Amino acid sequence: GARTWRFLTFGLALPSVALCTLNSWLHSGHRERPAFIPYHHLRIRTKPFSWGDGNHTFFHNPRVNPLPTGYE
Amino acid sequence: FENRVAEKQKLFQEDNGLPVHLKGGATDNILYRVTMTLCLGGTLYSLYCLGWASFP
Amino acid sequence: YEEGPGKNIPFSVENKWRLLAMMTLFFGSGFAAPFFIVRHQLLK
Amino acid sequence: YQTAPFDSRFPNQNQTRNCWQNYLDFHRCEKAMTAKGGDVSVCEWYRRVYKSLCPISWVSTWDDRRAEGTFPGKI
Amino acid sequence: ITAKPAKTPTSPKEQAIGLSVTFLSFLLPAGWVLYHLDNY
Amino acid sequence: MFINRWLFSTNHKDIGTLYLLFGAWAGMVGTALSLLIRAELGQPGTLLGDDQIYNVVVTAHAFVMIFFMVMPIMIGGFGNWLVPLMIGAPDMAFPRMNNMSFWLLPPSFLLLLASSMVEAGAGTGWTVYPPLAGNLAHAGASVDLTIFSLHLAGVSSILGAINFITTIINMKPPAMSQYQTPLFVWSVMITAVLLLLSLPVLAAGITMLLTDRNLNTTFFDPAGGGDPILYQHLFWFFGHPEVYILILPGFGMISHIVTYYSGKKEPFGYMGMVWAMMSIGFLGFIVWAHHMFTVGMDVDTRAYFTSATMIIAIPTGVKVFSWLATLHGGNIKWSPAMMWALGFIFLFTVGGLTGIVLANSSLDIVLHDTYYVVAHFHYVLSMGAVFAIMGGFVHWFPLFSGYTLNDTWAKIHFAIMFVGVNMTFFPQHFLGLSGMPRRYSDYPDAYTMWNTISSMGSFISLTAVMLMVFIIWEAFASKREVLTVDLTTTNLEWLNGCPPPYHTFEEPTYVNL
Amino acid sequence: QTHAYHMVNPSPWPLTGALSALLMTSGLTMWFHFNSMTLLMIGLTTNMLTMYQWWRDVIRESTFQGHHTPAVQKGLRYGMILFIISEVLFFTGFFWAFYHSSLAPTPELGGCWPPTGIHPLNPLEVPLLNTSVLLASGVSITWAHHSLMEGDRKHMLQALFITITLGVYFTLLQASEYYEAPFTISDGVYGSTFFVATGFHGLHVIIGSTFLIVCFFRQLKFHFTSNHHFGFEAAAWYWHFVDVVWLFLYVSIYWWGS
Amino acid sequence: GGGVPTDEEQATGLEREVMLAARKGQDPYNILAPKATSGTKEDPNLVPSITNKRIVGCICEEDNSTVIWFWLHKGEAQRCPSCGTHYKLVP
Amino acid sequence: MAYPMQLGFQDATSPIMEELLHFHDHTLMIVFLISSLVLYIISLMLTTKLTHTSTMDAQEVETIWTILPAIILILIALPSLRILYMMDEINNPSLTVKTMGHQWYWSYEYTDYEDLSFDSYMIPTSELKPGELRLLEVDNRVVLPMEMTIRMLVSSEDVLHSWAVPSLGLKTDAIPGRLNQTTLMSSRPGLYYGQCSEICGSNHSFMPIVLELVPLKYFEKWSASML
């Protein structure tokens, strides 16, 4: 019945989301970025990207995404 | 809100010979003409772009 | 819509010589295209 | 020594990991020996096997990456 | 199958024209390209 | 009226007609490409240029023959025309989505012809293997245009598969079980299931190739930890089912043609024929790596793929023997369509048997990437799929058009095409055994005689294709209107006359339990 | 006619859809190679116009004109099931790519998974929250379904609104995790498999959320009866498909692949 | 808590016609397989039509894969050309 | 190498190639027989005015139609898989040689003892010496010892290639980032030819393989002279 699935929605499902939201909130905060090492299997560039200067990924984050030449 | 489905059933069953994509009235014709103009015009532009890209 | 022989097709068969012309252009353009593509690639 | 013998760890047509493992084993051994100041001659078997199996350009690329600090294997 | 006689009969002469025009529509354009390959 | 009818169709027959016109045009392109191949190889030396222009022609030949000629004619053309009529249905389940399956193909074809016109073309083979198909060895737009062509052809066929499965399951007379539908209808339902499952995997693989080429992914690039051989697995997971997709509707048409021209009410061993097609469809998903016997896989893997591939001969044999058993005791009518079907049974058998030779991984070491493979697949495609298409076309042309062909001309056409295809492909066995590689613009001098004869064969096939255009013209030119058709009691598609009205089965059939 | 099946009015949308496909593909070509977005933006616009008018007409034919007999509805059920199967096989290709790369990591990676220099996300942080969100949305959409069958307009709307809100939450969480991720699509086969597989999944979540929002407005306008609501069933099946793909991604890429 | 329309309130067009006919045990849109009579000339299978002819498919014996198709015309009962079962049109 | 008007395989140079010839003869007899039987049966079905058009019972005959083909496939599979596993057997090679495919030539590396490597390019048609074979000769042949088990390792430094020598029964794909192994044993001295067997771009037709098989003592002196 609808009554039972509403009971599960409010009694189990959304409490689970609230608990995992709390869990994520507590373990949030910027972890320290690692030493840049120019590994050849990472920061692949076989063709410039079709946006920006060709060298920045689509959701480039200056804080944690180094360029082939290192952090900006 | 109120249930106005009966009034839309009357409009879409009116015996006027219109196909279903034009049967809502003048706005359907406009949105049809915009769609078909962008498609046919875009297709001509894609052909021009092939012409251009076919030579160095 | 028209029904019956010669009416259930997007091309006319009313005149066999106009039809020969249309079929010539249709099949001929398909067969010619690769030769003209090779010509295009050779002429670059 | 003629060539690298059959190795039951790598019995199939794909010999990539055989070259790789012997290259790692040689450089791990050489590091262990140079560190305590022991003798790299104990590492000789790994050297002969990787030189036999590994393409010259793979060894050359791996050597360049060890010198650069970009070699991704654990030595 | 049975069928009526032709509503617009195609005489041997008319067939020779249709067959000739059909073959030429395939052969002349390809022939022109292959003849001129050296020029390309 | 013309636009509403031919650009805005929701009618299974008119959409079928659009597919047959599209496929016929595609067949002329594919034929021209085949003649450029054989012109290059017809004497030792270089005719056109190096392997790039040559492999652009070879690659386009395959894509045009497979995606724009065979699939549109068998599935889009015969399937749309015949399936609703054979189950008494008033149209397809999704008659407007049906029209989009058709209209995706001209743009798909345009993207393929654009690939060949820009830069130096896609000289990759129809398999499009990286790294040759990657952004270093094939820099520029050609391979991306090929990928997008395949994406549109893939969507066309996926939506078409959803349409056929739904129509065949949901729109039969309520008394008719699946075991009372004609074999052609079974052949289209099974082909549609193969398309539904296989094309999405191709879509995933060519999408990965697209992102390796344009978004700096490395699915197939060892520098990023990728593997060129992963592409091969994804491609062939599709590519083996694809060849069963190309033949299954041909098997269905052959069952109908052999039954009809034997004067029989029914094919021999109906349930065996259904079993055989479902078995072939299933086995066709578990054999793909017989395309990869030289890539370096483990011996036990090669043993499994050898064995699983050979199993397909059992259900396939049941179909061949069932066709022979349909002929047995027939009142044989030596129609042109019967000649196509009899050539099919024999020539398909020969190409199936050379497939069984290739299934042996040990022997495939020496035959792989040689003309022996080319001989195998042209026996099953250029003498199997094509013979079924020509048989179906001459058998059902009067249904579709309301006019008859000249049977004498159609028999002449059969005789020329039979000589041409055998002269083209039989000698390629010798070239393969003696080691001539695939995708070569030129060959060591020893291979000259068989390449010369093969090229002469291809010109005989060209003469057949030109004559076929004339034969279709002569039928429309003369206008011999159909009067009576025999065996309508076991061939429902004929019972509404020739051509059938735009709307058929407005009042459905009466079938009681 | 004395059968129950739908003879559809001649329609331009198949042709506008086919041409929108040409404009999107030739547009992507023109964006990747000739530094221009114009064709692509025309193709995306005509694709959206086509989808809008086509599905509008399906609502006209069904809710307003009565063409969806039980036989037509049964056909649409099969159509949507077959469509979902095809989408399952599409994702299978990306899962195959992922397992191929991760089970036999090549020397370029360091011969290990995850590769040297890759710092995976913690699967117990936002990825676990995302799991809770999509599972919760599977519960709320079931509540919405039962409310509709029981004739309860207000509870159907509340449950469906909750389902859409969770779909939006998942999408905003994934956008933020994309931005925060220390690895990119260009970080070898790890970045390739991660972003393409989770990216197609994200696109399917946006499509599914859009479908649910279409159902929400149709419900506001009283289109659905307590017995006839195939658009809602189809959106719910699609939404369960999106949930199940997520569970496979979570176990495979986020957890087992960390 | 109500506010959702029923099919009885809101179904229209052919959907509504099918709905209302099924309540009356009637099948004008051919959703059900008709049940055979003994099929003798005295007790022919009665084939409804809105015109003067309709296609019959005869599954002559249970589990035959072969269906026998023919036009049934208004007038005297006709027979399946395979099994001789009688059918009569009722326009 | 192949010779004009050749119908079958190049003569076997290795024991495994001999095995493949006898396996092909067995398989081809079966192909000939089945092809012949089908053509004969077609012709028998089509050559009588006698008729039988009533429903025919299928089950008895379908037993024959399935069992006989299953037996024939087992008769192919048994020797097929014996040969597959024989090629895979452990042999103890005396020598390892690497080949790297390139656009458009082969490089060879003999690095068991010294750093010996060289490039191997097709002899252009205009530079053939009288008696030499168009598209098949190379400048630098792959000299190898006869009557010895050799491990050949195959890779690429660019696109796919495939390293083939038909008379030895050899074909190994050349895949960048992968080292594929095969074994080579020539029963005879001589010159053994092959051709690149994976489409690799503009000069795919023009990057052949020439093995030169000689006594060990000659191979050792050649090796020394190539450093």
Ligand code: HEA
């Ligand atoms: C219609 C297309 C089609 C069909 C139906 C088939 C059918 C089969 N094919 Fe083929 N094939 C291709 C098209 C097709 N093929 C193409 C295009 C390629 C190349 C792809 C590329 O690289 O571009 C190819 C390649 C290909 C390869 C790879 C070879 C290589 O690249 O090295 C192999 C390997 O096993 C294979 C085998 C088979 C087998 C076993 C069948 C079986 O299904 C055949 C079964 C039929 C019979 C056996 C005949 C009838 C049976 C009897 C009369 C019963 C008695 C028989 C026996 C007891 C044996 N084919």
Ligand code: HEA
């Ligand atoms: C359906 C598939 C199909 C068909 C029919 C053919 C037909 C032909 N093919 Fe090809 N071919 C392939 C699929 C096909 N091919 C594939 C997949 C490859 C591998 C590509 C690769 O290596 O990447 C290939 C490769 C290939 C090669 C090897 C190239 C190389 O390795 O370098 C050669 C060499 O001769 C060849 C020649 C021919 C010839 C002369 C024909 C002739 O027989 C063609 C003659 C003409 C016809 C058969 C008519 C066609 C038209 C119709 C039937 C229209 C009908 C009209 C109506 C019904 C109205 N093709």
Ligand SMILES: CCCCC/C=C\C/C=C/C/C=C\C/C=C\CCCC(=O)O[C@H](COC(=O)CCCCCCCCCCCCCCCCC)COP(=O)(O)OCCN
């Ligand atoms: C919250 C998730 C929602 C996704 C929306 C994001 C972008 C647009 C559309 C996405 C569609 C999904 C998959 C397409 C492929 C790649 C995108 C993967 C997901 C994504 O968005 O990946 C991003 C890269 O995007 C890039 O390159 C962007 C590249 C944009 C161009 C896309 C190219 C389209 C590919 C063609 C599609 C083919 C479809 C096949 C149809 C099959 C028919 C049979 C990751 O960012 P990053 O900066 O690298 O790393 C994060 C670092 N902080």
Ligand SMILES: CCCCCC/C=C\CCCCCCCCCC(=O)O[C@H](COC(=O)CCCCCCCCCCCCCCC)COP(=O)(O)OC[C@@H](O)CO
């Ligand atoms: C690089 C970019 C390349 C991308 C190419 C894009 C290709 C084409 C552009 C797409 C334009 C889409 C326009 C909307 C189409 C809606 C189809 C639809 O909804 O079709 C329905 C049937 O399919 C059903 O149900 C169930 C099936 C619904 C399918 C919806 C459309 C899918 C489009 C892409 C699918 C690819 C598959 C992904 C897996 C690989 C309805 O059938 P109709 O015959 O209309 O009506 C029947 C009447 O009785 C209804 O009252």
Ligand SMILES: CCCCCC/C=C\CCCCCCCCCC(=O)O[C@H](COC(=O)CCCCCCCCCCCCCCC)COP(=O)(O)OC[C@@H](O)CO
């Ligand atoms: C930003 C992203 C851009 C990419 C484009 C995709 C974006 C958004 C698309 C969202 C999908 C919305 C679909 C809306 C369909 C509304 C029409 C509808 O739902 O129609 C219903 C029928 O279902 C039907 O056709 C079922 C029709 C089902 C279609 C579902 C399609 C899923 C689409 C996927 C398309 C592309 C995916 C490819 C990804 C690679 C009508 O019948 P009922 O509901 O019973 O009503 C009748 C009752 O009132 C009678 O009492």
Ligand SMILES: CCCCCCCCCCO[C@@H]1O[C@H](CO)[C@@H](O[C@H]2O[C@H](CO)[C@@H](O)[C@H](O)[C@H]2O)[C@H](O)[C@H]1O
């Ligand atoms: C209704 C039917 C459909 C309407 C069709 C409309 C077609 C007209 C589009 C205008 O054409 C544009 O021209 C720009 C040039 O002015 C290009 O800019 C691009 O190309 C430039 C070349 O100089 C560079 O500056 C950059 O790449 C970039 O700005 C761009 O590609 C191109 O689209």
Ligand SMILES: CCCCCCCCCCO[C@@H]1O[C@H](CO)[C@@H](O[C@H]2O[C@H](CO)[C@@H](O)[C@H](O)[C@H]2O)[C@H](O)[C@H]1O
């Ligand atoms: C694979 C498919 C092709 C198969 C072979 C085609 C058969 C040939 C058909 C004839 O084609 C023509 O041949 C002429 C020569 O015979 C060419 O004229 C060329 O040669 C003439 C004689 O030298 C000159 O007068 C002309 O100006 C000159 O264009 C002409 O252009 C070309 O159309």
Ligand SMILES: CCCCCCCCCCO[C@@H]1O[C@H](CO)[C@@H](O[C@H]2O[C@H](CO)[C@@H](O)[C@H](O)[C@H]2O)[C@H](O)[C@H]1O
């Ligand atoms: C209904 C039809 C009527 C309207 C016709 C359509 C008119 C559209 C013309 C706009 O052209 C655009 O110009 C931008 C700027 O010139 C380009 O950005 C390009 O250049 C930018 C920098 O200038 C870069 O940032 C981008 O990455 C890059 O794609 C963009 O591609 C291109 O589409």
Ligand SMILES: C[C@H](CCC(=O)O)[C@H]1CC[C@H]2[C@@H]3[C@H](O)C[C@@H]4C[C@H](O)CC[C@]4(C)[C@H]3C[C@H](O)[C@]12C
């Ligand atoms: C007042 C109105 C009545 C709708 C009606 O019966 O016509 C109610 C019924 C259910 C309501 C919706 C649901 O309660 C869920 C949402 C609750 C939020 O607090 C507001 C928006 C929200 C999306 C509501 C908007 C609106 O007030 C709705 C649609």
Ligand code: CUA
């Ligand atoms: Cu190297 Cu082909």
Ligand code: NA
């Ligand atoms: Na040549």
Ligand SMILES: [Zn+2]
């Ligand atoms: Zn009967």
